[PDB]
Amino acid sequence: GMNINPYFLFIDVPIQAAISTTFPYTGVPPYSHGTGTGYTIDTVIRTHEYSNKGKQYISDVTGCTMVDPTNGPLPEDNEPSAYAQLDCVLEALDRMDEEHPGLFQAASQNAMETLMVTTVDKLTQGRQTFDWTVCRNQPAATALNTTITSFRLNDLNGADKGGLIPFCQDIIDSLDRPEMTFFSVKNIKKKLPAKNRKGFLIKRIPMKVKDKITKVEYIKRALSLNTMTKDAERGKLKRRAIATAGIQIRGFVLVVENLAKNICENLEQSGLPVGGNEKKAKLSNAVAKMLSNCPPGGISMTVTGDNTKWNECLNPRIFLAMTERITRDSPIWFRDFCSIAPVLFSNKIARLGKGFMITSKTKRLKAQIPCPDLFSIPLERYNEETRAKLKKLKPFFNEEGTASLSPGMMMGMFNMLSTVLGVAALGIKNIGNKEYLWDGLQSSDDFALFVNAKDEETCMEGINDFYRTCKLLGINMSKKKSYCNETGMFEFTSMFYRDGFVSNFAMELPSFGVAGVNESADMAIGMTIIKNNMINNGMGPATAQTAIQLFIADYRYTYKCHRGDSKVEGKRMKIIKELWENTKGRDGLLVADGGPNIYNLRNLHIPEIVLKYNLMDPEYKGRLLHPQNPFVGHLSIEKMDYDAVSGTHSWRTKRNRSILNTDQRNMILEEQCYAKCCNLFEACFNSASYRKPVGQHSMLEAMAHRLRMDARLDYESGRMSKDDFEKAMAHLGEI
Amino acid sequence: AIERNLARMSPLVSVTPKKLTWEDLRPIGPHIYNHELPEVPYNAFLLMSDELGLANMTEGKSKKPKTLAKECLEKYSTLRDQTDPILIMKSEKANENFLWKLWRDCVNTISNEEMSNELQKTNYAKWATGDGLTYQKIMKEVAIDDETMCQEEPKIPNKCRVAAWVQTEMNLLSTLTSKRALDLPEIGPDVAPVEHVGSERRKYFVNEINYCKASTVMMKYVLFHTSLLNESNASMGKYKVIPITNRVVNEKGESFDMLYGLAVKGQSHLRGDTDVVTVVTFEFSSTDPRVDSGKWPKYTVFRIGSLFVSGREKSVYLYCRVNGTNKIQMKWGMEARRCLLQSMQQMEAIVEQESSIQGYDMTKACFKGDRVNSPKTFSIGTQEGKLVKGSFGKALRVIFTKCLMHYVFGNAQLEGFSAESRRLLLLIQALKDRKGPWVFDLEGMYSGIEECISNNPWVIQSAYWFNEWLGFEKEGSKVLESVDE
Amino acid sequence: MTLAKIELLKQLLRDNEAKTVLKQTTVDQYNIIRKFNTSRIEKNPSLRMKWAMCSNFPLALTKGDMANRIPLEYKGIQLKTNAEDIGTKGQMCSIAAVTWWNTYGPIGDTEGFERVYESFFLRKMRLDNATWGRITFGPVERVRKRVLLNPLTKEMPPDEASNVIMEILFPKEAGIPRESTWIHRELIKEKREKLKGTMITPIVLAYMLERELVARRRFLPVAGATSAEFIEMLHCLQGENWRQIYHPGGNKLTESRSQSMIVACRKIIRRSIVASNPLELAVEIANKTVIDTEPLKSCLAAIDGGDVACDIIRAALGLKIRQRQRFGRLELKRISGRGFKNDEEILIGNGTIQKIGIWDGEEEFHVRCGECRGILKKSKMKLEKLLINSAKKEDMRDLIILCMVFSQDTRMFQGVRGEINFLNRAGQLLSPMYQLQRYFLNRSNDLFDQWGYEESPKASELHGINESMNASDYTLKGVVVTRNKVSITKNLSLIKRTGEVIMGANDVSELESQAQLMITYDTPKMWEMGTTKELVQNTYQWVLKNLVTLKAQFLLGKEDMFQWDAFEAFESIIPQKMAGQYSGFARAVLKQMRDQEVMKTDQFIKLLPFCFSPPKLRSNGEPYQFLKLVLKGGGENFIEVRKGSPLFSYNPQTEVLTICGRMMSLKGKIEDEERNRSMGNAVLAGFLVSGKYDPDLGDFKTIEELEKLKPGEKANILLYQGKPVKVVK
RNA sequence: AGUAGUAACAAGA
RNA sequence: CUGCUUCUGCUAU
RNA sequence: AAUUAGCAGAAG
Numbered sequence A: 001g002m003n004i005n006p007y008f009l010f011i012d013v014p015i016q017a018a019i020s021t022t023f024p025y026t027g028v029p030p031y032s033h034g035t036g037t038g039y040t041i042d043t044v045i046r047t048h049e050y051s052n053k054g055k056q057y058i059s060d061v062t063g064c065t066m067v068d069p070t071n072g073p074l075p076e077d078n079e080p081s082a083y084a085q086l087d088c089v090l091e092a093l094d095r096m097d098e099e100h101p102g103l104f105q106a107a108s109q110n111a112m113e114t115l116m117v118t119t120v121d122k123l124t125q126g127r128q129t130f131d132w133t134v135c136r137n138q139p140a141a142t143a144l145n146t147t148i149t150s151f152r153l154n155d156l157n158g159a160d161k162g163g164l165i166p167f168c169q170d171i172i173d174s175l176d177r178p179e180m181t182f183f184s185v186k187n188i189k190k191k192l193p194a195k196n197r198k199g200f201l202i203k204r205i206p207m208k209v210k211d212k213i214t215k216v217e218y219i220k221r222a223l224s225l226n227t228m229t230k231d232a233e234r235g236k237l238k239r240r241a242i243a244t245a246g247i248q249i250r251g252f253v254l255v256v257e258n259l260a261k262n263i264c265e266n267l268e269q270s271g272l273p274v275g276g277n278e279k280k281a282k283l284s285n286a287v288a289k290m291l292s293n294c295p296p297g298g299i300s301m302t303v304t305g306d307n308t309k310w311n312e313c314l315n316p317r318i319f320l321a322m323t324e325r326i327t328r329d330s331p332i333w334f335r336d337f338c339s340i341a342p343v344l345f346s347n348k349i350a351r352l353g354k355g356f357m358i359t360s361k362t363k364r365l366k367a368q369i370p371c372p373d374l375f376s377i378p379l380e381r382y383n384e385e386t387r388a389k390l391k392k393l394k395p396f397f398n399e400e401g402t403a404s405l406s407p408g409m410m411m412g413m414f415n416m417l418s419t420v421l422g423v424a425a426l427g428i429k430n431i432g433n434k435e436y437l438w439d440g441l442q443s444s445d446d447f448a449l450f451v452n453a454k455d456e457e458t459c460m461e462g463i464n465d466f467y468r469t470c471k472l473l474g475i476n477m478s479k480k481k482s483y484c485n486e487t488g489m490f491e492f493t494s495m496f497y498r499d500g501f502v503s504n505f506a507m508e509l510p511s512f513g514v515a516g517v518n519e520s521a522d523m524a525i526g527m528t529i530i531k532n533n534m535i536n537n538g539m540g541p542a543t544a545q546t547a548i549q550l551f552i553a554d555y556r557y558t559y560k561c562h563r564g565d566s567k568v569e570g571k572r573m574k575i576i577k578e579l580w581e582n583t584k585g586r587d588g589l590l591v592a593d594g595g596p597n598i599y600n601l602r603n604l605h606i607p608e609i610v611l612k613y614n615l616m617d618p619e620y621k622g623r624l625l626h627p628q629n630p631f632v633g634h635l636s637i638e639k640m641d642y643d644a645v646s647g648t649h650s651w652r653t654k655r656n657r658s659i660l661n662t663d664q665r666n667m668i669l670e671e672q673c674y675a676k677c678c679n680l681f682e683a684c685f686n687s688a689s690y691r692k693p694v695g696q697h698s699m700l701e702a703m704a705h706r707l708r709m710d711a712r713l714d715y716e717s718g719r720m721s722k723d724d725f726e727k728a729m730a731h732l733g734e735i
Numbered sequence B: 001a002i003e004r005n006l007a008r009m010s011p012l013v014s015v016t017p018k019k020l021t022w023e024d025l026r027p028i029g030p031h032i033y034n035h036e037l038p039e040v041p042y043n044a045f046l047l048m049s050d051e052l053g054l055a056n057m058t059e060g061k062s063k064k065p066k067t068l069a070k071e072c073l074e075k076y077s078t079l080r081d082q083t084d085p086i087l088i089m090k091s092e093k094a095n096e097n098f099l100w101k102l103w104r105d106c107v108n109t110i111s112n113e114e115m116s117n118e119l120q121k122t123n124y125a126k127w128a129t130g131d132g133l134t135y136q137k138i139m140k141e142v143a144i145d146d147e148t149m150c151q152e153e154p155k156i157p158n159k160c161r162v163a164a165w166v167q168t169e170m171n172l173l174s175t176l177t178s179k180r181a182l183d184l185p186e187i188g189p190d191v192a193p194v195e196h197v198g199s200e201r202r203k204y205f206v207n208e209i210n211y212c213k214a215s216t217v218m219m220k221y222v223l224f225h226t227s228l229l230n231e232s233n234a235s236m237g238k239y240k241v242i243p244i245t246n247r248v249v250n251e252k253g254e255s256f257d258m259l260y261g262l263a264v265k266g267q268s269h270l271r272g273d274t275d276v277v278t279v280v281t282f283e284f285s286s287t288d289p290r291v292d293s294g295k296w297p298k299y300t301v302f303r304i305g306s307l308f309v310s311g312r313e314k315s316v317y318l319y320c321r322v323n324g325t326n327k328i329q330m331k332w333g334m335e336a337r338r339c340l341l342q343s344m345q346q347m348e349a350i351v352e353q354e355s356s357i358q359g360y361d362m363t364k365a366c367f368k369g370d371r372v373n374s375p376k377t378f379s380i381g382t383q384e385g386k387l388v389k390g391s392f393g394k395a396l397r398v399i400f401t402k403c404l405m406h407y408v409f410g411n412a413q414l415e416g417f418s419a420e421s422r423r424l425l426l427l428i429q430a431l432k433d434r435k436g437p438w439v440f441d442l443e444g445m446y447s448g449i450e451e452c453i454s455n456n457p458w459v460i461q462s463a464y465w466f467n468e469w470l471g472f473e474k475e476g477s478k479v480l481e482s483v484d485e
Numbered sequence C: 001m002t003l004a005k006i007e008l009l010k011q012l013l014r015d016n017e018a019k020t021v022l023k024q025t026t027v028d029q030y031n032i033i034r035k036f037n038t039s040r041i042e043k044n045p046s047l048r049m050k051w052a053m054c055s056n057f058p059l060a061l062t063k064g065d066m067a068n069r070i071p072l073e074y075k076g077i078q079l080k081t082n083a084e085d086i087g088t089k090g091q092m093c094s095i096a097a098v099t100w101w102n103t104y105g106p107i108g109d110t111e112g113f114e115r116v117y118e119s120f121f122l123r124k125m126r127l128d129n130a131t132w133g134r135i136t137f138g139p140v141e142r143v144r145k146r147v148l149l150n151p152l153t154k155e156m157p158p159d160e161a162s163n164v165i166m167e168i169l170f171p172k173e174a175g176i177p178r179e180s181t182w183i184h185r186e187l188i189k190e191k192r193e194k195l196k197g198t199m200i201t202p203i204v205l206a207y208m209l210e211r212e213l214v215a216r217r218r219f220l221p222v223a224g225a226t227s228a229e230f231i232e233m234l235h236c237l238q239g240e241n242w243r244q245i246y247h248p249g250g251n252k253l254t255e256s257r258s259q260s261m262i263v264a265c266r267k268i269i270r271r272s273i274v275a276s277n278p279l280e281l282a283v284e285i286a287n288k289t290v291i292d293t294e295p296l297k298s299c300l301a302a303i304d305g306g307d308v309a310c311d312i313i314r315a316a317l318g319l320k321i322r323q324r325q326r327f328g329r330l331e332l333k334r335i336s337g338r339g340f341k342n343d344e345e346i347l348i349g350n351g352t353i354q355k356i357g358i359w360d361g362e363e364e365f366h367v368r369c370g371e372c373r374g375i376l377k378k379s380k381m382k383l384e385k386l387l388i389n390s391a392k393k394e395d396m397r398d399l400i401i402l403c404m405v406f407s408q409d410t411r412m413f414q415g416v417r418g419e420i421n422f423l424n425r426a427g428q429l430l431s432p433m434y435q436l437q438r439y440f441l442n443r444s445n446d447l448f449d450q451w452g453y454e455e456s457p458k459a460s461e462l463h464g465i466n467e468s469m470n471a472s473d474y475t476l477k478g479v480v481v482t483r484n485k486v487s488i489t490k491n492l493s494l495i496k497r498t499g500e501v502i503m504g505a506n507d508v509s510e511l512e513s514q515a516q517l518m519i520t521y522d523t524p525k526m527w528e529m530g531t532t533k534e535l536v537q538n539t540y541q542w543v544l545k546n547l548v549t550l551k552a553q554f555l556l557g558k559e560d561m562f563q564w565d566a567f568e569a570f571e572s573i574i575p576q577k578m579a580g581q582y583s584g585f586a587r588a589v590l591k592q593m594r595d596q597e598v599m600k601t602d603q604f605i606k607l608l609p610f611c612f613s614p615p616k617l618r619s620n621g622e623p624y625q626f627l628k629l630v631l632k633g634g635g636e637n638f639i640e641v642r643k644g645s646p647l648f649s650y651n652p653q654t655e656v657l658t659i660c661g662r663m664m665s666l667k668g669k670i671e672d673e674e675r676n677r678s679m680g681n682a683v684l685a686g687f688l689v690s691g692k693y694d695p696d697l698g699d700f701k702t703i704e705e706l707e708k709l710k711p712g713e714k715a716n717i718l719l720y721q722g723k724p725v726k727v728v729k
Numbered sequence D: 001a002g003u004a005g006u007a008a009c010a011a012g013a
Numbered sequence E: 001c002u003g004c005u006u007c008u009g010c011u012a013u
Numbered sequence F: 001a002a003u004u005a006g007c008a009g010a011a012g
């Protein structure tokens, strides 16, 4: 009775060689179902739990219960600690400024030179921004545009000066306004007859109105984060909460992250902003340098570590001091600009999500209790854990459904400045002139420490001193996820070094599917992914040919484009079998037209129409590569349209986002008005899609001057008659 | 100031390093040995090793799945013409009469002259799919006044012990069968010598992987999830009979069509990505549930007759179960063929390493052996307490079954167990390399693992396998104490 | 169609919302309002693609007369949607409509595909006209380097290339005329000729032009072929354990052929210099060396240039030596001189310390740059004379700049007042002199200041120019604008007819670089021109394969198996001064393990390839002692004597050897009573093991404490982490 | 019922 | 109600 | 020796 043990593969193979079997990335990642009030409230409580021994007070700007853990008492146990001592932070920056002389002033000069050229369109490079005019999440360009068109009502016209600096001046000149006026969106909840259990339907038709808010409510909205839960997070058992900052915050976070990026690029002992094979070569060079730096006869230990509560124990009052000590020679305006962002991060107000849902089981009823109405019911109508969390939230719960969140770094937009703090903890290298020396690597919250000493008890003293030093800056090294072996095998950001970094195939395994843009682009993407994993991820030739076969099978079963000689039935396979029987040279059919695969290893970078261009029938090539094929939307002036060069398998799938019971009339019409204005502007100026058009004047004036000059040049070169020229100038005079 | 602020810090803030020895490593997950916990029930989507495929030797026509199920049931006319239930097992909150009437409705719907596999909304269909079980949503003021509308506690996953069927699923899905099931398309012709080496490696790797039971189960899952997503998007307000099917080729090149049972898709207005569609599955089998009674507390098992696969006569049971799935598990079921790749690369790399020691392509020397190379044998499993070495293709099939079961029983517990046990695998490797690893808080490191072992059968069996392999490593380490002393 | 645009503008300004959108949005905020989207983009594209294909009509039609060719029903299949849903929605169709277009659609002209996708058609042509070689199975040491992915013709920086593309396609709204318009007006007018009457969308033409012009450099793992003709097929080229020879198509450049020729000559001399009669082995390897299509002698014949190594291989084969060297744009020919490079800690003008190569002696050169000539004369870290001819002023400027930097004078180092990058972003070692050369091109005015000035010469044809590049009064110190056969040795030295050498085997540089093209050694044992880890792994595989014969001939013979052809290849990666010391130590340890009957097989395998060179003992007939044996290149490359190493490890329980990662199994070729034997008898030379850890003799003695002992004195030795032993001489 | 898993879906974002 | 940064890949909707 | 965005995947 032989019983199979799959761990016994590890008897003949080391773990780092067979590490790709320890990554279950063929399974389903964990998603979040329902609300995100529980993890947000637990985040607020656990953030104030590691900081409650500091100075608690009440802000006189908003009215929140602020908490100041910095310069507080020292920790007494191995609990997480947020009380970062200021003198230790400034001394670590003294060591890091001694060791790299001239680094801080060079980084500050480069960041100030980058800031004086940056325009406001840099604030359209975000995924989903918390919009304060609707208290929701809009996209970044939509949130920026609503903010600009709302600041124009309050006589803040500094966004028409082009740059970023007058826009941030407008931001901090909005905080000293007695009343703000903006554009809000309300709706009509129309009642309609239906046929279901409840009987009727509630159709929400949204339309845009004008709103007016007071000063302190604006200060609370502009400092607010929007909280949600993160999905598809592999490697964890329980979920967590994340936050999203507004448009009045990212405009200042950009400069501080650019400053810290300029510092991080020039530190030898970091892991940012490198990435890819660049990071592998840098880490291998660093490990070899720290391996040849060992004393004759000593012992070099390596701590594979991780920090617990990175966003929950760092403080913006330390980042304010770091931007005050880094920018110690810049002009005073730049020091104010670089000190605004950790000030706004020390007064952040977390919004508490969607609320909790209460159900009556015997009546088959349920309802949603929101965040303002959270304490409106007794706490006996909750669970155990929700009752405990709502009891702990009550000092900080504000009466509008938000909560004060002074300590911590919940939104986590300082991935480079905290790396600077971790390297400043790594750049100390000794305490008390004892017989060791440490040196490490630090990405944003993952480190790897190397301690060279005479024997391993001295190495343990060095590790204990590094832990005590990290406690002084707000860095709690996790004693459960860290371990320490000798040098040669460690792990850093899921890169497993065993005398050279090993090849992990299973991490980049979820990219191998059909990416889903259209047929042609998915064929190109899939073959390029197989080729790049063959280059730098250890996928051999046989595995790559099998991946070609599996990609072709998944591609055919997705796009319903099986081979024309097969017997599979469908709405597409009818005409596919007809095209197979019609075509003479069937080896030139694309796989989307029911054709044979001719991809192999040596031709993975050549596209599908190029590889099959000398095997095509001329009729099929003329029908495929038609310049006026109605599946690719050309650039026409809204015939005289331009020729769309690529095939018919470059079609577009309009993701018609229509919510249930939501008549999106007006939100379609405003987006269509913006699209019409931009389409006429691109008709007048052709390079608007290649190069960003600069200019501090109106679009109507630019279009009017371009059309006036265009008519004048079309008249004198004969292309325009005198009556057409008179019509043109008579139209332009009435504009 | 750092040395100043390190002298007024208490000595109770330390890292407490501890030298890791072999006897310091305790078995992970002790509660799975406790006999006062129930055995972990079978909670997969479809049957994997207890499957029964009704064969039908078709004549080269991928005509329709409804016509395929009709012809395959016309071949087995006695199992189709059963109208009397013989109840063998029943689930707790089940209904044997409604499930038998729904199976007869599926049989009468799949074998008609019509062209549609839709069901009507009868009483048994509305019970088994589940209609009107959503809670009514009322306004917040009426619920604020209502002192009865509490907020319900979440159901924590139950704690379970090691059920002895997971070892049976590992042992049977890692064996060779006589049929293929992979639908691998053709590839371009080979010109470079890399492509000749790759094809002559692929023949060995595929001939080991393709003729095994886990490949048939994998293709069953892939095809059923593909047809289920197709019927879910095309038919949202309709109950649809979807046959569970597969295409098989034996060693002779003859192609059979294997029917594995039928399924009833519920109402599938899946607006979100985590919305559930109820699938009522009726699967054939030949395994008596009275043998292992704790394996199936989720199934309703009837008996519908006998089957002569040879001169021997076997029985046929019908496992009925209400089940459910969402869009994301259907998408990751349509992409399950990647379980080849993660299992192929991990073996092929080993071949390549051997190819850089001897100087020639060592695929044949690894799989089957040649004149100047004994074949590669891997320590593959236990047999009455001792250790057995198996073949190369055996280990390839074991890694393939492991990746397939990573898909099949995959949820948040398997991810958390995988991460927090990988952190301990690297410690055991640092103990085997004689690097002398040091830990700082081992009990919390063990406690991060042991909160992921709730009811996942793969996680509980993997903790059992971890404890077995760790006992073997502790037994093996007792030779190093005689080195230079 | 200007009048149509004016009429569209008049139709748009009568709508009161677009009027206030146009009148208030600045042109800088067009970039903001262009991306205005009210609904979020959907999260999963693959799930929406697998879910949207199972619907009636997932696609979207473009309204026109070409969309009306598709019928509303084709044999029962509704291809496109019904026209009753036209009103403020749009028209949709199924994927079967795409397949009907590909089968029964109207025919069109495929001219515009071949123009736009010309880069991919050239990419296909370079693979169709390409021959393959043979695949080899063995270790490949890959180095991560920034390489160019795709071949080009005119590699331009992306801002200059964007300005050029704006001057080709959109010349009206092009901006300020920069310097890029001047040095590329040929390409601008030629591409504007070739793209004259075309009707493609201009943004597709912009991206095909930037695919033709702009470079793309990425950090890829390369091994032996870094040119963009070999990087485009890098996946099929080599792996971690195999290498496929490839001969690409198209055409190559002489700069890559010269670079790979220099690399191949350096590798041939470096492997040759450890042999007996190195000239014979050097010619024997240099005959059968093919730089991707052709032998090494043809490359040495046709290429003007090279280094010391190219000249030694040229004179070894019987060719005329070309003593011409390069410093980027500065081409030089050595008239007479003899200088040797040593590393110097140079402080530079902004206060940074760098190890820079500094030469000695006194040298004279015929220098040249562009179409300007000159004669330069220098010494150790000092410019002395530079007599140049009359040519263009900026070429003369570059010539004097390159002669100033090439002289390695103290003023050139002291004038670097700025930000110099002596390192990569990934911490790799850039060349100091080429970095100073690239710095001192445009910001050389500080070099003009810190160099100084003096009077002119007052001879007949000697007039000195100034920074205005005219014949002024005050010229720079040392610059005058005037208007006017070897043998080869056994040790690979180039001696003249009289005897004064010009080049030697000590003068080849040790920059172990990666070749541009692919070098092939058509020889048995072509692995001896590999890198360090390849030679270590191949030598240890050769010791493992022949372990029984080596073990028997060591247990019988005395000095007839320390000499093999494999250890001759192994010696060329041990540094020169420590090779005899490592040899004496390892020979004494192996003779110790033979003479007294304690034998270890892992130590025999480990320290056998170090027993090749003749033993350099101490001054009293006793060997040295070592902790580790450091090999050439990198920090990982060492062999630990007592511990394990990155290049060597041994598991005694499983009996498994690890060489550079790869695991061989010693189970079967071993003495079965060896695990009862102690490691400390095979750790030092003359020191054996007698007892246990004794604190009555002191702490663990170091190397200098053990080398100054006497026969009989006992010490404590720590083998690895946990095992202290006693030790007697 | 069921999927599941610290909170939801089991039709009306 | 799917945040920030880095790297890679594809495309110019 | 040196060389303008959108979306997806991974890591943190």
Ligand SMILES: [Mg+2]
Pocket (backbone or CB within 6 Å): A304, A305, A306, A446, A447, A491, A492, A493, A494
């Ligand atoms: Mg880590």
